[PDB]
Symmetry: D2
């Protein structure tokens, strides 16, 4: 099956930022033809730790910027929703509607996404056990979703820390396609006080682990200059490093693929 | 004064709310030093299963809670799940409750704060005690003046929650602290530990306790495994008041 | 039943330190006659994080110092053993043989302690679930132990942190008398790099919780000047604060006692 | 070269050790680029139950391991539980193993280091990756020169272990790292995850893998639920060598 790579800047800092990242993602989609790329960027960071942190320029602006990316580069689009009313307008541009981790159990949000006819990707809550995602998928199927993804993004491990239990990949595979979030899984929740931290040095090794275990795609936030990012400045991957990372996981996926267990 | 938030988990019917409300009113008259607040959700918006009981809607719920307040003169509290619900709920709710999974949703907090009502935020199972400082700041920014933080357990491995009592004194630095005695013992995805842990909460020191109670928990449509039998409420309240009376002498300052 | 208070300096820094603490503990035993005091101090810190940290002055010296305390103040004694061969010599002075947390599953150590005829107190391992202590008690009974205690001292919660799950008290009570370790439960394992950390501000509130829930005794390390201690300098209670703490828990225990559940 | 430590969990009989040893010798000849080390415990000193299988004693065990080394020319490794055992075990053991629960027992580490043999310390389930730096220092202080640290899971709630693969690169800063593929999936107080996680270990990067194997795990007297069927060992070794070959290109320096 075609491997999915969901990538883009964490937040829609500006339409300009999007086109800059989109251009590179488009270049890679032409090179890695065996990969299905989906451009990701949040029109709103509705769950920042601090009231003073950057949120975004609004739904309207965001959808417009994302539409420009799709129009200019012919790339599929994905963005996350935070309340039920956002599903409809977002569905006009998003090929995949993303459900935030903290909201993976909010029935109406899932239902709103499902009835749009678009694919739905649910970030597994940091509080959820792998087997608890079966009911999440059930809700989505009940709501009409035909293409469902479950994203591993770490689990609460003590305070301000997340651990990735790779046993989750084969477990969740029982009921949906699985995506590994390489950038949020290394973040340190509320690790900086008013903001969350992260350990960039672990992004690559853990993504290698994900493809060796086996998944249907990877999710990576990337920014031309992470240090200047307005969100997840500590975990976004420098855009120049994206190509090498993707080549690496495709290579590891290929050699490991013959050993992937049948669910 | 010490806060006691009690009531049936879900508004299964205003009939149920009236039966539970009568007992709470009674206790209310017996324990004058305690401020009682009637709680019940008009919607269980986060059930694990799509086939589980959610409720009868916001309108029916607000109406039923209206009945309780008017008929018994008891303050009211219920939780909201999306921003638009804040205003209509604030019509009857003296305290707007923010769900644990939603404790970081900025717009929900701001929406609640804007109503002018008191706001009680359930501490997310993924949150550290010190991470709640930012939660309080959001509410203050939104105009909230009466802010509560509720301890309801922290993720401890899979399908289990642990109560780290160190959280009470930490959260007390920036808000009044409430201990949720019934959800803290639930196994995500029990009853025998409700009383022991509530005794610990008052021994450590908190500003109030949250307890879901139902005439027949066995038949409850929500949290059947952890809702306290109505008939046992009086005894537990008396017990925690006695422990608090003695222990309060040692509560640390700030 | 008579409430147990196990207290003393973490390590036997010197026979002088012991007599200084013993004197105060003796004074309190005369005041709190409803309490059974047991003087505690390790002749060896055999599991320090760093090879450079203080361990002790040897078994011989330690037993001699502990014997002096028992002889001079008529106090019961408890100390921990680390290898099977230490059970016999230690049993000559120790009324209660303590089994370290990391070693709570070492069959031969438990058996060695049990056959001495002395009481045995096992620190619950940071890796053990409350219900897993049933087999620990079974081993001890199998080995001849007639008086057994299980001590709650925290559970691994993420890295370098411990949490106290008070549900452990009523669970362990099903098969043994339960003791709450007020000082090790707030320590931060390896929190200082070459040594462990601790948060003294939580010792009192958590001990209040322990007696409200209900236990058969408490364990507290105390030192005339904690800041100068050679071990657990961050968690040992200042000796001057001991009396007030004990009075407080007896008061809370009394008022809460009528509500203690029957096992 | 890449290390592969394999063998039956417990020395149920030297007969068993010989059967497993023959297969390991065979693989040894087929995978010349891999350094095989035969492992088996002469005593399960930390079983949960007093009624569970422990072993036939140190003497019988050392004799059986002697047989394996002499008959197949395979290096040997076994664990010790008390200081006095280091010397006699070092007679046959090329690598002395330190149990996870005992990774902080200074005298056991020093005793092992004094023998002059290599020392492999199982990382305690209560230990953080960076906490192992001190463990290595103790061994170096004791004269140890060949030191290994083994990842075998970390306490994650009750009766469960999680493998935090971030540990591999962290521990690599001060010692060679081994990944225990069979104990990492055990539930304290399963099998389907052994292969997936071992693939991850080599994709991330480690200096070797530890795998308990038995002709008929179902009948094993120890770790029956997690011991790998002998017949599946070859396939898994070939698989991890292939993944390592490709992934090694990306292993981070130090
Ligand atoms: O991904 C979710 C959050 O927005 C995340 O923790 C980053 O936000 P913060 O830096 O405001 O905590
Ligand atoms: O209680 C056990 C230890 O000795 C504890 O962690 C304190 O030792 P450290 O400061 O050497 O880690």
């Amino acid at each position: 099956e075609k491997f999915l790579v969901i990538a883009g800047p964490c937040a829609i800092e500006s339409e300009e930022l999007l086109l800059k990242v989109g251009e590179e993602i488009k270049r890679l989609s032409e090179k890695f033809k065996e990969v299905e790329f989906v451009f990701k960027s949040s029109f709103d960071k509705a769950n920042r730790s601090s009231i003073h942190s950057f949120r975004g320029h609004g739904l309207e602006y965001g959808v417009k910027a994302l539409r420009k990316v799709k129009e200019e580069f012919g790339l599929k689009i994905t963005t996350d929703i935070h309340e039920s009313w956002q599903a409809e307008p977002v569905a006009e541009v998003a090929d995949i509607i993303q459900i935030p981790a903290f909201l993976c159990r909010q029935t109406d949000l899932l239902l709103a996404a499902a009835k749009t006819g678009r694919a739905v990707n649910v970030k597994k809550g940091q509080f959820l056990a792998p087997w608890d995602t079966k009911n999440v998928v059930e809700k989505l199927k009940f709501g009409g979703a035909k293409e469902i993804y479950l994203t591993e993004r770490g689990t609460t491990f003590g305070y301000n820390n997340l651990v990735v239990d790779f046993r989750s990949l084969p477990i969740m595979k029982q009921w949906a396609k699985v995506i590994y979030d390489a950038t949020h899984s290394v973040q340190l929740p509320g690790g900086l006080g008013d903001k969350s931290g992260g350990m960039r040095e672990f992004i690559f090794p853990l993504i290698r682990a994900a493809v060796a275990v086996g998944c249907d795609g990877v999710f990576m936030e990337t920014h031309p200059e992470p240090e200047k990012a307005l969100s997840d400045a500590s975990t976004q991957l420098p855009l120049s490093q994206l190509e090498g990372i993707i080549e690496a996981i495709l290579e590891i996926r290929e050699v490991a693929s013959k050993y992937y267990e049948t669910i």
